[PDB]
Protein backbone atom coordinates (compact mmCIF):
# COMPACT_ATOMS: atom_id res chain seq x y z
CA UNK A 244 0.00 0.00 0.00
CA UNK A 245 1.01 3.64 0.51
CA UNK A 246 0.32 6.75 -1.54
CA UNK A 247 2.92 9.33 -2.54
CA UNK A 248 3.34 12.32 -4.83
CA UNK A 249 4.84 10.37 -7.73
CA UNK A 250 6.47 11.49 -10.97
CA UNK A 251 6.98 9.50 -14.17
CA UNK A 252 10.40 7.95 -14.89
CA UNK A 253 12.40 10.72 -16.57
CA UNK A 254 14.79 8.48 -18.51
CA UNK A 255 13.12 8.93 -21.89
CA UNK A 256 13.20 12.72 -21.49
CA UNK A 257 16.82 12.95 -20.28
CA UNK A 258 18.01 11.67 -23.66
CA UNK A 259 16.27 14.64 -25.26
CA UNK A 260 17.60 17.47 -23.08
CA UNK A 261 20.30 19.63 -24.69
CA UNK A 262 21.97 22.99 -24.11
CA UNK A 263 21.22 25.92 -26.41
CA UNK A 264 23.15 29.19 -26.50
CA UNK A 265 22.64 32.17 -28.83
CA UNK A 266 24.62 35.28 -28.25
CA UNK A 267 24.78 35.54 -24.50
CA UNK A 268 21.60 33.64 -23.59
CA UNK A 269 22.04 29.99 -22.64
CA UNK A 270 19.09 27.71 -21.80
CA UNK A 271 17.85 24.13 -22.24
CA UNK A 272 16.42 22.62 -25.41
CA UNK A 273 14.33 19.60 -26.37
CA UNK A 274 15.94 17.44 -29.08
CA UNK A 275 13.23 15.38 -30.78
CA UNK A 276 14.09 13.79 -34.15
CA UNK A 277 16.14 16.44 -36.06
CA UNK A 278 14.61 19.53 -34.39
CA UNK A 279 15.65 21.33 -31.19
CA UNK A 280 12.80 23.14 -29.42
CA UNK A 281 13.74 25.98 -27.06
CA UNK A 282 12.12 29.16 -25.70
CA UNK A 283 12.56 32.17 -27.96
CA UNK A 284 13.90 34.09 -24.96
CA UNK A 285 17.24 32.59 -26.07
CA UNK A 286 17.69 35.40 -28.62
CA UNK A 287 17.19 38.26 -26.13
CA UNK A 288 19.44 40.41 -23.94
CA UNK A 289 18.67 41.79 -20.50
CA UNK A 290 17.98 45.29 -21.86
CA UNK A 291 15.31 44.48 -24.47
CA UNK A 292 13.11 42.51 -22.09
CA UNK A 293 10.53 45.17 -21.22
CA UNK A 294 9.17 44.91 -24.77
CA UNK A 295 11.29 42.87 -27.23
CA UNK A 296 10.55 42.67 -30.95
CA UNK A 297 11.34 38.97 -31.32
CA UNK A 298 10.86 39.20 -35.09
CA UNK A 299 13.50 41.91 -35.55
CA UNK A 300 15.81 40.22 -33.01
CA UNK A 301 15.69 37.06 -35.17
CA UNK A 302 16.31 38.74 -38.52
CA UNK A 303 19.79 39.54 -37.19
CA UNK A 304 20.27 35.87 -36.23
CA UNK A 305 21.34 32.98 -38.47
CA UNK A 306 21.91 29.25 -38.09
CA UNK A 307 25.54 29.68 -36.97
CA UNK A 308 24.50 31.93 -34.07
CA UNK A 309 22.65 29.07 -32.32
CA UNK A 310 24.91 26.71 -30.35
CA UNK A 311 23.28 23.36 -29.59
CA UNK A 312 25.36 21.03 -27.41
CA UNK A 313 24.10 17.58 -26.42
CA UNK A 314 26.36 16.64 -23.54
CA UNK A 315 29.50 17.52 -25.49
CA UNK A 316 28.29 16.49 -28.96
CA UNK A 317 27.69 19.69 -30.93
CA UNK A 318 24.93 19.70 -33.56
CA UNK A 319 24.97 21.52 -36.91
CA UNK A 320 22.03 23.93 -37.23
CA UNK A 321 20.62 23.87 -40.78
CA UNK A 322 17.44 25.83 -40.15
CA UNK A 323 15.53 27.95 -37.68
CA UNK A 324 11.97 29.23 -37.34
CA UNK A 325 9.85 30.92 -34.69
CA UNK A 326 6.54 29.20 -33.87
CA UNK A 327 4.71 31.46 -31.40
CA UNK A 328 7.03 31.70 -28.35
CA UNK A 329 9.37 28.80 -29.19
CA UNK A 330 12.22 28.43 -31.66
CA UNK A 331 12.61 25.35 -33.87
CA UNK A 332 16.28 24.76 -34.74
CA UNK A 333 16.71 22.22 -37.55
CA UNK A 334 19.87 20.21 -36.87
CA UNK A 335 21.78 17.72 -39.03
CA UNK A 336 21.75 14.68 -36.71
CA UNK A 337 18.57 13.00 -35.55
CA UNK A 338 18.52 12.05 -31.88
CA UNK A 339 19.16 8.29 -31.61
CA UNK A 340 17.22 8.43 -28.31
CA UNK A 341 14.08 10.10 -29.71
CA UNK A 342 11.13 8.26 -28.11
CA UNK A 343 7.54 7.87 -29.20
CA UNK A 344 6.36 11.42 -28.53
CA UNK A 345 3.43 13.74 -29.14
CA UNK A 346 2.68 17.38 -28.41
CA UNK A 347 -0.29 17.77 -26.06
CA UNK A 348 -1.99 20.88 -24.74
CA UNK A 349 -3.44 19.89 -21.36
CA UNK A 350 -6.49 21.40 -19.66
CA UNK A 351 -6.57 23.17 -16.28
CA UNK A 352 -6.58 20.41 -13.67
CA UNK A 353 -4.38 17.84 -15.42
CA UNK A 354 -0.99 16.86 -14.03
CA UNK A 355 2.44 16.26 -15.54
CA UNK A 356 6.01 15.51 -14.47
CA UNK A 357 8.63 18.26 -14.75
CA UNK A 358 12.28 17.39 -15.41
CA UNK A 359 14.23 20.39 -14.11
CA UNK A 360 17.41 20.97 -16.15
CA UNK A 361 20.28 23.45 -15.90
CA UNK A 362 22.55 24.00 -18.93
CA UNK A 363 21.22 20.84 -20.56
CA UNK A 364 21.84 18.55 -17.55
CA UNK A 365 18.92 17.01 -15.63
CA UNK A 366 18.78 18.03 -11.97
CA UNK A 367 15.56 16.59 -10.54
CA UNK A 368 12.06 15.42 -11.38
CA UNK A 369 8.77 16.34 -9.68
CA UNK A 370 5.02 16.28 -10.36
CA UNK A 371 2.99 19.42 -11.11
CA UNK A 372 -0.59 20.35 -11.86
CA UNK A 373 -1.84 23.05 -14.24
CA UNK A 374 -3.61 25.35 -11.78
CA UNK A 375 -6.97 26.89 -12.76
CA UNK A 376 -5.25 30.25 -13.38
CA UNK A 377 -2.98 28.50 -15.93
CA UNK A 378 0.09 28.74 -13.68
CA UNK A 379 2.18 26.08 -11.93
CA UNK A 380 3.86 25.85 -8.54
CA UNK A 381 7.25 24.29 -9.12
CA UNK A 382 10.97 24.89 -8.53
CA UNK A 383 12.78 26.85 -11.26
CA UNK A 384 16.08 28.66 -10.74
CA UNK A 385 18.15 30.64 -13.23
CA UNK A 386 18.94 28.27 -16.08
CA UNK A 387 15.83 26.11 -15.75
CA UNK A 388 14.65 27.72 -18.95
CA UNK A 389 13.43 25.14 -21.50
CA UNK A 390 12.68 22.52 -18.87
CA UNK A 391 9.76 20.40 -20.06
CA UNK A 392 6.67 18.88 -18.46
CA UNK A 393 5.49 15.50 -19.68
CA UNK A 394 3.28 12.50 -19.12
CA UNK A 395 4.42 9.05 -20.18
CA UNK A 396 1.50 6.83 -21.07
CA UNK A 397 2.65 3.32 -21.94
CA UNK A 398 5.28 4.12 -24.57
CA UNK A 399 4.32 7.62 -25.80
CA UNK A 400 5.93 10.67 -24.18
CA UNK A 401 3.24 13.37 -24.24
CA UNK A 402 5.13 16.64 -23.92
CA UNK A 403 2.80 19.38 -22.68
CA UNK A 404 4.81 22.16 -20.99
CA UNK A 405 7.99 24.15 -21.56
CA UNK A 406 9.09 26.54 -18.84
CA UNK A 407 9.46 30.24 -19.65
CA UNK A 408 8.91 32.72 -16.81
CA UNK A 409 8.54 33.20 -13.09
CA UNK A 410 5.93 35.77 -12.12
CA UNK A 411 6.45 38.20 -9.23
CA UNK A 412 4.10 35.89 -7.29
CA UNK A 413 6.77 33.18 -7.25
CA UNK A 414 4.56 30.98 -9.47
CA UNK A 415 5.66 29.82 -12.92
CA UNK A 416 4.25 30.25 -16.44
CA UNK A 417 5.09 28.43 -19.65
CA UNK A 418 3.98 27.27 -23.10
CA UNK A 419 2.95 24.10 -24.87
CA UNK A 420 5.42 22.53 -27.28
CA UNK A 421 3.89 24.63 -30.09
CA UNK A 422 4.80 27.90 -28.38
CA UNK A 423 1.43 29.00 -27.03
CA UNK A 424 1.41 30.19 -23.43
CA UNK A 425 -1.03 28.72 -20.95
CA UNK A 426 -3.21 31.63 -19.90
CA UNK A 427 -2.89 35.36 -20.63
CA UNK A 428 0.88 35.49 -20.13
CA UNK A 429 3.35 37.09 -22.54
CA UNK A 430 7.14 36.71 -22.57
CA UNK A 431 7.80 40.33 -21.57
CA UNK A 432 8.80 41.94 -18.27
CA UNK A 433 5.47 43.75 -18.11
CA UNK A 434 2.81 43.95 -15.40
CA UNK A 435 1.60 40.32 -15.34
CA UNK A 436 -0.55 38.87 -12.57
CA UNK A 437 -2.29 35.52 -12.22
CA UNK A 438 -6.00 35.44 -11.47
CA UNK A 439 -7.80 33.72 -8.64
CA UNK A 440 -6.15 30.34 -8.02
CA UNK A 441 -9.18 28.22 -7.26
CA UNK A 442 -9.00 24.63 -6.01
CA UNK A 443 -9.45 21.70 -8.43
CA UNK A 444 -12.44 20.10 -6.72
CA UNK A 445 -12.50 16.80 -8.63
CA UNK A 446 -8.84 16.16 -7.79
CA UNK A 447 -9.45 16.61 -4.05
CA UNK A 448 -12.26 14.04 -4.18
CA UNK A 449 -9.95 11.56 -5.90
CA UNK A 450 -7.37 12.15 -3.18
CA UNK A 451 -9.99 11.52 -0.49
CA UNK A 452 -10.80 8.23 -2.21
CA UNK A 453 -7.12 7.28 -2.16
CA UNK A 454 -7.19 7.87 1.60
CA UNK A 455 -10.03 5.39 2.10
CA UNK A 456 -8.00 2.76 0.23
CA UNK A 457 -4.91 3.38 2.38
CA UNK A 458 -6.56 3.36 5.80
CA UNK A 459 -7.48 6.96 6.63
CA UNK A 460 -11.29 6.91 6.74
CA UNK A 461 -12.15 9.21 9.66
CA UNK A 462 -13.48 11.94 7.35
CA UNK A 463 -16.20 9.55 6.13
CA UNK A 464 -19.44 11.08 7.36
CA UNK A 465 -22.97 9.90 7.88
CA UNK A 466 -24.51 12.72 5.78
CA UNK A 467 -24.95 13.19 2.03
CA UNK A 468 -25.66 16.18 -0.21
CA UNK A 469 -26.73 17.24 -3.70
CA UNK A 470 -24.53 18.53 -6.52
CA UNK A 471 -25.95 22.07 -6.41
CA UNK A 472 -25.76 22.34 -2.63
CA UNK A 473 -22.12 21.22 -2.64
CA UNK A 474 -21.24 23.75 -5.35
CA UNK A 475 -22.77 26.30 -2.95
CA UNK A 476 -20.06 25.52 -0.40
CA UNK A 477 -17.47 25.03 -3.15
CA UNK A 478 -17.90 28.60 -4.40
CA UNK A 479 -17.75 30.08 -0.89
CA UNK A 480 -14.37 28.42 -0.28
CA UNK A 481 -13.12 29.18 -3.83
CA UNK A 482 -13.34 25.63 -5.20
CA UNK A 483 -13.81 24.69 -8.83
CA UNK A 484 -17.51 24.08 -9.62
CA UNK A 485 -18.10 20.34 -9.78
CA UNK A 486 -19.62 19.06 -13.03
CA UNK A 487 -21.30 15.79 -13.96
CA UNK A 488 -18.29 14.93 -16.09
CA UNK A 489 -16.35 15.13 -12.81
CA UNK A 490 -18.81 12.76 -11.14
CA UNK A 491 -18.55 10.27 -14.01
CA UNK A 492 -14.74 10.11 -13.94
CA UNK A 493 -14.80 9.38 -10.19
CA UNK A 494 -17.05 6.39 -10.96
CA UNK A 495 -14.32 3.74 -10.74
CA UNK A 496 -13.16 5.24 -7.45
CA UNK A 497 -16.71 5.19 -6.06
CA UNK A 498 -17.07 1.57 -7.21
CA UNK A 499 -14.01 0.11 -5.49
CA UNK A 500 -14.67 1.84 -2.17
CA UNK A 501 -18.44 1.46 -2.37
CA UNK A 502 -18.87 5.13 -1.45
CA UNK A 503 -21.09 7.28 -3.63
CA UNK A 504 -19.53 10.44 -5.05
CA UNK A 505 -22.15 12.66 -3.42
CA UNK A 506 -21.51 11.00 -0.05
CA UNK A 507 -17.86 11.90 -0.50
CA UNK A 508 -18.89 15.47 -1.40
CA UNK A 509 -20.65 15.76 1.95
CA UNK A 510 -17.44 14.73 3.72
CA UNK A 511 -15.56 17.42 1.79
CA UNK A 512 -18.32 19.88 2.72
CA UNK A 513 -17.80 19.07 6.40
CA UNK A 514 -14.03 19.36 5.96
CA UNK A 515 -14.39 22.81 4.39
CA UNK A 516 -16.82 24.06 7.06
CA UNK A 517 -15.17 22.49 10.11
CA UNK A 518 -11.55 22.00 9.08
CA UNK A 519 -9.56 18.94 10.08
CA UNK A 520 -9.41 19.51 13.87
CA UNK A 521 -5.68 18.90 13.96
CA UNK A 522 -5.94 15.57 12.15
CA UNK A 523 -4.20 14.43 8.97
CA UNK A 524 -5.37 12.70 5.80
CA UNK A 525 -2.68 10.65 4.01
CA UNK A 526 -0.06 12.43 6.10
CA UNK A 527 -1.18 15.95 5.13
CA UNK A 528 -2.92 18.61 7.22
CA UNK A 529 -4.17 20.36 4.06
CA UNK A 530 -6.42 19.31 1.19
CA UNK A 531 -4.39 18.01 -1.76
CA UNK A 532 -5.31 19.20 -5.22
CA UNK A 533 -2.54 17.78 -7.42
CA UNK A 534 -3.88 14.23 -7.86
CA UNK A 535 -6.16 13.65 -10.83
CA UNK A 536 -8.61 10.71 -10.79
CA UNK A 537 -6.19 8.94 -13.15
CA UNK A 538 -3.23 9.61 -10.85
CA UNK A 539 -5.00 7.70 -8.06
CA UNK A 540 -5.97 4.64 -10.12
CA UNK A 541 -2.43 4.47 -11.52
CA UNK A 542 -0.87 4.43 -8.04
CA UNK A 543 -3.59 2.07 -6.72
CA UNK A 544 -3.25 -0.62 -9.44
CA UNK B 545 12.63 30.38 -7.06
CA UNK B 546 10.26 27.76 -5.64
CA UNK B 547 10.89 24.69 -3.51
CA UNK B 548 9.46 21.23 -4.17
CA UNK B 549 9.85 17.63 -3.04
CA UNK B 550 12.31 16.64 -5.76
CA UNK B 551 13.70 13.26 -6.82
CA UNK B 552 16.85 12.53 -8.81
CA UNK B 553 16.56 11.74 -12.54
CA UNK B 554 15.86 8.00 -12.71
CA UNK B 555 17.28 7.40 -16.19
CA UNK B 556 20.51 5.78 -15.04
CA UNK B 557 18.59 3.38 -12.80
CA UNK B 558 15.93 2.43 -15.38
CA UNK B 559 18.62 0.81 -17.54
CA UNK B 560 19.43 -1.46 -14.59
CA UNK B 561 15.92 -2.68 -13.69
CA UNK B 562 15.11 -6.24 -14.77
CA UNK B 563 12.52 -8.91 -14.02
CA UNK B 564 13.45 -11.97 -11.99
CA UNK B 565 11.31 -15.09 -11.59
CA UNK B 566 12.15 -18.31 -9.74
CA UNK B 567 9.52 -20.93 -9.38
CA UNK B 568 6.35 -18.96 -8.87
CA UNK B 569 7.83 -15.78 -7.35
CA UNK B 570 8.40 -12.89 -9.74
CA UNK B 571 9.98 -9.59 -8.64
CA UNK B 572 12.37 -6.87 -9.83
CA UNK B 573 16.15 -7.11 -10.00
CA UNK B 574 19.10 -4.73 -10.26
CA UNK B 575 21.44 -5.52 -13.17
CA UNK B 576 24.85 -3.98 -12.45
CA UNK B 577 27.81 -5.24 -14.51
CA UNK B 578 27.32 -9.05 -14.82
CA UNK B 579 25.37 -9.55 -11.56
CA UNK B 580 21.62 -9.32 -10.91
CA UNK B 581 20.72 -8.33 -7.34
CA UNK B 582 17.25 -9.29 -6.09
CA UNK B 583 15.55 -10.00 -2.75
CA UNK B 584 15.90 -13.59 -1.61
CA UNK B 585 12.12 -13.70 -1.14
CA UNK B 586 12.16 -14.71 -4.83
CA UNK B 587 12.82 -18.36 -3.85
CA UNK B 588 9.87 -18.63 -1.43
CA UNK B 589 6.24 -19.76 -1.67
CA UNK B 590 3.27 -18.34 0.21
CA UNK B 591 3.19 -21.28 2.66
CA UNK B 592 6.78 -21.16 3.96
CA UNK B 593 6.68 -17.47 4.85
CA UNK B 594 6.02 -17.71 8.59
CA UNK B 595 9.55 -19.07 9.05
CA UNK B 596 11.42 -20.01 5.85
CA UNK B 597 14.78 -21.76 5.82
CA UNK B 598 16.27 -19.76 2.95
CA UNK B 599 19.39 -21.96 2.99
CA UNK B 600 17.46 -25.20 2.43
CA UNK B 601 15.12 -23.48 -0.07
CA UNK B 602 18.21 -22.54 -2.13
CA UNK B 603 19.90 -25.95 -2.06
CA UNK B 604 16.98 -27.16 -4.18
CA UNK B 605 17.53 -24.26 -6.62
CA UNK B 606 20.04 -24.04 -9.47
CA UNK B 607 21.05 -21.48 -12.09
CA UNK B 608 18.38 -22.63 -14.57
CA UNK B 609 15.59 -22.03 -12.03
CA UNK B 610 16.21 -18.25 -12.03
CA UNK B 611 14.63 -16.40 -14.97
CA UNK B 612 16.15 -12.95 -15.56
CA UNK B 613 14.46 -10.93 -18.31
CA UNK B 614 15.67 -7.44 -19.23
CA UNK B 615 12.77 -6.02 -21.21
CA UNK B 616 12.58 -9.09 -23.43
CA UNK B 617 16.30 -9.94 -23.54
CA UNK B 618 16.79 -13.06 -21.41
CA UNK B 619 20.10 -13.48 -19.56
CA UNK B 620 21.98 -16.73 -18.94
CA UNK B 621 22.53 -17.36 -15.22
CA UNK B 622 26.00 -18.83 -14.60
CA UNK B 623 26.08 -18.49 -10.82
CA UNK B 624 24.07 -17.69 -7.73
CA UNK B 625 24.84 -16.89 -4.10
CA UNK B 626 22.96 -15.59 -1.06
CA UNK B 627 24.49 -12.54 0.65
CA UNK B 628 22.39 -11.87 3.77
CA UNK B 629 18.84 -11.19 2.46
CA UNK B 630 19.69 -10.67 -1.23
CA UNK B 631 20.55 -13.07 -4.03
CA UNK B 632 23.42 -12.42 -6.46
CA UNK B 633 22.74 -14.06 -9.84
CA UNK B 634 25.84 -14.15 -12.04
CA UNK B 635 24.75 -13.68 -15.66
CA UNK B 636 26.66 -14.04 -18.93
CA UNK B 637 26.10 -10.56 -20.41
CA UNK B 638 27.27 -7.39 -18.73
CA UNK B 639 24.78 -4.54 -18.77
CA UNK B 640 25.85 -2.05 -21.48
CA UNK B 641 24.03 0.61 -19.42
CA UNK B 642 25.83 -0.05 -16.12
CA UNK B 643 26.62 3.39 -14.65
CA UNK B 644 29.23 4.52 -12.17
CA UNK B 645 27.73 2.95 -9.05
CA UNK B 646 28.54 2.21 -5.42
CA UNK B 647 26.78 0.45 -2.58
CA UNK B 648 26.06 2.81 0.32
CA UNK B 649 24.46 2.16 3.69
CA UNK B 650 22.83 5.45 4.69
CA UNK B 651 22.19 6.69 8.23
CA UNK B 652 18.80 7.51 9.78
CA UNK B 653 17.88 10.96 8.49
CA UNK B 654 19.38 10.78 5.00
CA UNK B 655 17.18 10.86 1.90
CA UNK B 656 17.12 8.95 -1.38
CA UNK B 657 15.00 8.61 -4.52
CA UNK B 658 12.93 5.46 -5.01
CA UNK B 659 12.21 4.15 -8.52
CA UNK B 660 9.07 2.04 -8.12
CA UNK B 661 9.04 -0.90 -10.56
CA UNK B 662 6.55 -3.65 -11.34
CA UNK B 663 7.72 -6.77 -13.21
CA UNK B 664 10.92 -5.01 -14.25
CA UNK B 665 9.21 -1.91 -15.70
CA UNK B 666 9.62 1.50 -14.04
CA UNK B 667 6.35 3.03 -12.86
CA UNK B 668 7.23 6.21 -10.96
CA UNK B 669 9.93 7.99 -8.98
CA UNK B 670 9.64 9.73 -5.60
CA UNK B 671 11.86 10.94 -2.75
CA UNK B 672 12.04 9.17 0.63
CA UNK B 673 13.83 9.57 3.94
CA UNK B 674 15.15 6.83 6.22
CA UNK B 675 13.01 7.44 9.31
CA UNK B 676 14.63 7.20 12.77
CA UNK B 677 12.96 3.80 13.30
CA UNK B 678 14.72 2.55 10.13
CA UNK B 679 11.47 2.44 8.13
CA UNK B 680 10.28 4.43 5.12
CA UNK B 681 6.93 5.90 4.09
CA UNK B 682 6.56 5.22 0.39
CA UNK B 683 4.19 3.60 -2.14
CA UNK B 684 4.75 -0.12 -2.76
CA UNK B 685 2.13 -2.43 -4.25
CA UNK B 686 2.37 -6.14 -5.04
CA UNK B 687 5.27 -6.52 -7.44
CA UNK B 688 7.28 -3.54 -6.21
CA UNK B 689 9.68 -6.06 -4.73
CA UNK B 690 13.31 -5.28 -5.63
CA UNK B 691 12.64 -1.61 -6.24
CA UNK B 692 15.76 0.37 -5.33
CA UNK B 693 16.49 3.65 -3.57
CA UNK B 694 19.39 5.75 -4.78
CA UNK B 695 21.17 9.07 -4.73
CA UNK B 696 22.94 10.34 -7.83
CA UNK B 697 25.87 12.56 -6.94
CA UNK B 698 27.51 13.99 -10.04
CA UNK B 699 28.11 10.78 -12.00
CA UNK B 700 28.05 8.04 -9.33
CA UNK B 701 24.78 6.23 -8.59
CA UNK B 702 24.89 5.45 -4.85
CA UNK B 703 22.44 2.60 -4.38
CA UNK B 704 21.34 2.42 -0.74
CA UNK B 705 17.95 0.67 -0.47
CA UNK B 706 16.17 -2.37 -1.90
CA UNK B 707 12.53 -2.86 -1.00
CA UNK B 708 11.46 -6.04 0.79
CA UNK B 709 8.41 -5.85 3.07
CA UNK B 710 5.42 -3.81 4.13
CA UNK B 711 4.73 -3.92 7.85
CA UNK B 712 1.19 -4.10 9.26
CA UNK B 713 1.65 -0.38 10.01
CA UNK B 714 1.57 0.40 6.29
CA UNK B 715 5.22 1.52 6.45
CA UNK B 716 7.97 -0.19 4.44
CA UNK B 717 11.21 -1.97 5.36
CA UNK B 718 14.14 -2.97 3.19
CA UNK B 719 17.86 -3.75 2.94
CA UNK B 720 21.04 -2.19 1.65
CA UNK B 721 22.53 -3.57 -1.55
CA UNK B 722 24.56 -6.04 0.54
CA UNK B 723 21.43 -7.66 1.97
CA UNK B 724 21.39 -6.21 5.49
CA UNK B 725 18.04 -4.90 6.67
CA UNK B 726 17.76 -1.39 8.06
CA UNK B 727 16.66 -1.87 11.66
CA UNK B 728 15.55 -5.00 13.52
CA UNK B 729 13.44 -6.37 10.66
CA UNK B 730 13.60 -9.93 9.34
CA UNK B 731 12.11 -11.27 6.09
CA UNK B 732 9.52 -13.45 7.85
CA UNK B 733 5.78 -13.01 8.43
CA UNK B 734 6.37 -12.78 12.18
CA UNK B 735 5.30 -10.20 14.76
CA UNK B 736 7.30 -7.16 13.57
CA UNK B 737 6.65 -3.62 14.78
CA UNK B 738 8.54 -0.38 14.22
CA UNK B 739 9.61 1.67 17.22
CA UNK B 740 8.87 5.28 18.01
CA UNK B 741 9.06 7.29 14.77
CA UNK B 742 10.68 10.46 16.02
CA UNK B 743 11.11 13.60 13.92
CA UNK B 744 14.44 14.37 12.22
CA UNK B 745 15.07 17.74 13.87
CA UNK B 746 17.99 18.90 11.72
CA UNK B 747 15.97 18.32 8.53
CA UNK B 748 13.09 20.48 9.77
CA UNK B 749 15.50 23.34 10.46
CA UNK B 750 16.89 23.07 6.93
CA UNK B 751 13.34 23.20 5.59
CA UNK B 752 12.61 26.32 7.64
CA UNK B 753 15.71 27.91 6.12
CA UNK B 754 14.45 27.06 2.63
CA UNK B 755 11.24 28.90 3.53
CA UNK B 756 13.14 32.10 4.38
CA UNK B 757 14.82 31.95 0.97
CA UNK B 758 11.49 31.52 -0.84
CA UNK B 759 9.50 34.24 0.90
CA UNK B 760 7.75 32.63 3.87
CA UNK B 761 9.36 34.33 6.89
CA UNK B 762 6.46 34.83 9.32
CA UNK B 763 7.74 32.13 11.69
CA UNK B 764 10.91 34.19 12.28
CA UNK B 765 10.72 35.22 15.91
CA UNK B 766 12.36 37.81 18.09
CA UNK B 767 13.53 35.26 20.72
CA UNK B 768 16.50 32.90 20.86
CA UNK B 769 17.36 29.81 22.91
CA UNK B 770 20.16 27.45 23.92
CA UNK B 771 20.89 23.98 22.58
CA UNK B 772 19.96 22.20 25.82
CA UNK B 773 16.75 24.18 26.32
CA UNK B 774 15.63 23.42 22.76
CA UNK B 775 16.33 19.71 23.21
CA UNK B 776 14.04 20.00 26.25
CA UNK B 777 11.15 20.92 23.96
CA UNK B 778 12.39 18.55 21.26
CA UNK B 779 12.09 15.54 23.55
CA UNK B 780 8.62 16.53 24.77
CA UNK B 781 7.33 16.63 21.17
CA UNK B 782 9.29 13.48 20.17
CA UNK B 783 11.95 15.20 18.06
CA UNK B 784 15.44 13.90 17.41
CA UNK B 785 17.94 15.39 19.88
CA UNK B 786 19.89 18.12 18.12
CA UNK B 787 23.69 17.71 18.14
CA UNK B 788 26.53 20.11 17.42
CA UNK B 789 27.25 18.18 14.24
CA UNK B 790 23.71 19.18 13.25
CA UNK B 791 24.45 22.83 14.01
CA UNK B 792 27.66 22.73 11.96
CA UNK B 793 25.99 21.31 8.84
CA UNK B 794 23.34 24.05 8.94
CA UNK B 795 26.19 26.59 8.86
CA UNK B 796 25.92 27.41 5.15
CA UNK B 797 22.16 27.85 5.54
CA UNK B 798 22.64 30.18 8.51
CA UNK B 799 25.22 32.15 6.51
CA UNK B 800 23.12 32.89 3.43
CA UNK B 801 20.05 33.94 5.42
CA UNK B 802 22.03 35.66 8.16
CA UNK B 803 19.95 33.86 10.80
CA UNK B 804 21.78 32.01 13.55
CA UNK B 805 20.90 28.34 14.00
CA UNK B 806 19.83 28.86 17.61
CA UNK B 807 17.56 31.74 16.56
CA UNK B 808 15.94 29.33 14.13
CA UNK B 809 15.62 26.77 16.94
CA UNK B 810 13.61 29.29 18.95
CA UNK B 811 11.21 29.71 16.01
CA UNK B 812 10.80 25.94 15.87
CA UNK B 813 10.25 25.94 19.64
CA UNK B 814 7.43 28.46 19.22
CA UNK B 815 6.00 26.42 16.34
CA UNK B 816 5.97 23.27 18.48
CA UNK B 817 4.40 25.00 21.49
CA UNK B 818 1.90 27.21 19.64
CA UNK B 819 1.32 25.42 16.34
CA UNK B 820 0.93 27.29 13.07
CA UNK B 821 -2.39 29.08 13.79
CA UNK B 822 -3.85 28.00 10.47
CA UNK B 823 -0.91 29.33 8.47
CA UNK B 824 1.33 27.51 6.00
CA UNK B 825 5.09 27.30 5.49
CA UNK B 826 6.18 26.54 1.91
CA UNK B 827 2.62 25.46 1.15
CA UNK B 828 2.42 22.93 4.00
CA UNK B 829 0.41 23.05 7.24
CA UNK B 830 2.74 20.49 8.85
CA UNK B 831 6.46 20.46 9.64
CA UNK B 832 8.44 18.76 6.88
CA UNK B 833 11.11 16.28 7.87
CA UNK B 834 12.22 14.79 4.54
CA UNK B 835 14.65 17.54 3.44
CA UNK B 836 18.26 17.12 4.53
CA UNK B 837 20.53 20.20 4.73
CA UNK B 838 22.08 19.01 1.45
CA UNK B 839 18.67 18.68 -0.21
CA UNK B 840 18.02 22.38 0.43
CA UNK B 841 21.36 23.68 -0.87
CA UNK B 842 20.98 21.49 -3.97
CA UNK B 843 17.55 22.93 -4.79
CA UNK B 844 18.69 26.47 -3.85
CA UNK B 845 21.82 26.57 -6.06
Ligand SMILES: *c1nnc(-c2ccc(Cl)cc2)o1
Pocket residue numbers: 270282284292387388389406407408409429430431432433
Ligand atom coordinates in the same frame (compact mmCIF):
# COMPACT_ATOMS: atom_id res chain seq x y z
C1 LIG C 1 13.73 31.57 -19.31
N1 LIG C 1 13.19 31.36 -20.50
N2 LIG C 1 12.42 32.47 -20.78
C2 LIG C 1 12.54 33.31 -19.76
C3 LIG C 1 11.86 34.68 -19.61
C4 LIG C 1 11.03 35.21 -20.58
C5 LIG C 1 10.46 36.46 -20.38
C6 LIG C 1 10.69 37.18 -19.21
CL1 LIG C 1 9.94 38.78 -18.96
C7 LIG C 1 11.51 36.65 -18.24
C8 LIG C 1 12.08 35.40 -18.44
O1 LIG C 1 13.33 32.75 -18.85
Ligand SMILES: *c1nnc(-c2ccc(Cl)cc2)o1
Pocket residue numbers: 571583585593688689690707708709710730731732733734
Ligand atom coordinates in the same frame (compact mmCIF):
# COMPACT_ATOMS: atom_id res chain seq x y z
C1 LIG D 1 8.76 -8.54 -1.77
N1 LIG D 1 10.03 -8.88 -1.61
N2 LIG D 1 10.13 -9.48 -0.38
C2 LIG D 1 8.91 -9.51 0.15
C3 LIG D 1 8.52 -10.08 1.52
C4 LIG D 1 9.44 -10.68 2.37
C5 LIG D 1 9.01 -11.18 3.59
C6 LIG D 1 7.68 -11.08 3.98
CL1 LIG D 1 7.14 -11.72 5.56
C7 LIG D 1 6.77 -10.48 3.14
C8 LIG D 1 7.19 -9.98 1.93
O1 LIG D 1 8.08 -8.92 -0.69
